[PDB]
Design a protein around this ligand. Structure first.
Ligand code: HEC
Ligand code: HEC
Ligand code: HEC
Ligand code: HEC
Length: 91
């Protein structure tokens, strides 16, 4: 069955893996800290991730409830040059 990223994570730690008491915060800071607690920091990631260190939280790209496992974010919501992850990773 198609699984969202939120659901995939919840199978290995519950909704509380990312949300205090399984309940979302208003400003997403708690959740961003959880993402980084397992995955590390943007500055230690690849070329798509690094420039966003200090500017974005993970959820500004990864819409974990809306996106399938496997589905990755695109760039057009914030950049107007047609860039893709491919165009940046394999620059
Ligand atoms: C981390 C991989 C997550 C897991 C596991 C689950 N959710 Fe989540 N959810 C996550 C983020 C980054 C956000 C947005 C930021 C925020 O502040 O939370 C969300 C959002 C939701 C929402 C919407 C909140 C809003 O519209 O005000 C809800 C209701 C929500 N999440 C519920 C929820 C449940 C019930 C989960 C377990 C099945 C669950 N989330 C897991 C990240 C993650
Ligand atoms: C530890 C308890 C975690 C928290 C909190 C979050 N993630 Fe996670 N994530 C974790 C594991 C062990 C895995 C599986 C290994 C893998 O890399 O696949 C994942 C996976 C993802 C993925 C998929 C990566 C891929 O294989 O293509 C994404 C994109 C991802 N996680 C994002 C992410 C975000 C945005 C989180 C906070 C909202 C988050 N994870 C929390 C472990 C943990
Ligand atoms: C938009 C600018 C993003 C932000 C902010 C974060 N991620 Fe991301 N992530 C994005 C894309 C387009 C992709 C696919 C291309 C790639 O660079 O690999 C990813 C991929 C991941 C993965 C898998 C990496 C792999 O080698 O397979 C993980 C686990 C992941 N992203 C996690 C993650 C976390 C935890 C973030 C906040 C610290 C985060 N990403 C931010 C786009 C974007
Ligand atoms: C808004 C939520 C964003 C999304 C989606 C993506 N990026 Fe981004 N990017 C964002 C900010 C706030 C910044 C800081 C500099 C700026 O443009 O104002 C960046 C920066 C980059 C850069 C550095 C070079 C530059 O254009 O400034 C790269 C290489 C970059 N962003 C790549 C990139 C890719 C590949 C994305 C889609 C996966 C992507 N960004 C999404 C904000 C946002």
């Amino acid at each position: 069955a198609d699984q969202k990223l939120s659901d995939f994570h919840a199978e290995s730690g519950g909704c509380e893996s990312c949300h205090k008491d399984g309940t979302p915060s208003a400003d997403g800071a708690f959740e961003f800290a959880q993402c980084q607690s397992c995955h590390g920091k943007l500055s230690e990631m690849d070329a798509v991730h690094k420039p966003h260190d200090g500017n974005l939280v993970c959820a500004d790209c990864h819409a974990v409830h809306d996106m399938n496992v496997g589905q990755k974010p695109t760039c057009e919501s914030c950049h107007d040059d047609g860039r893709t992850s491919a165009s940046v990773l394999k620059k």
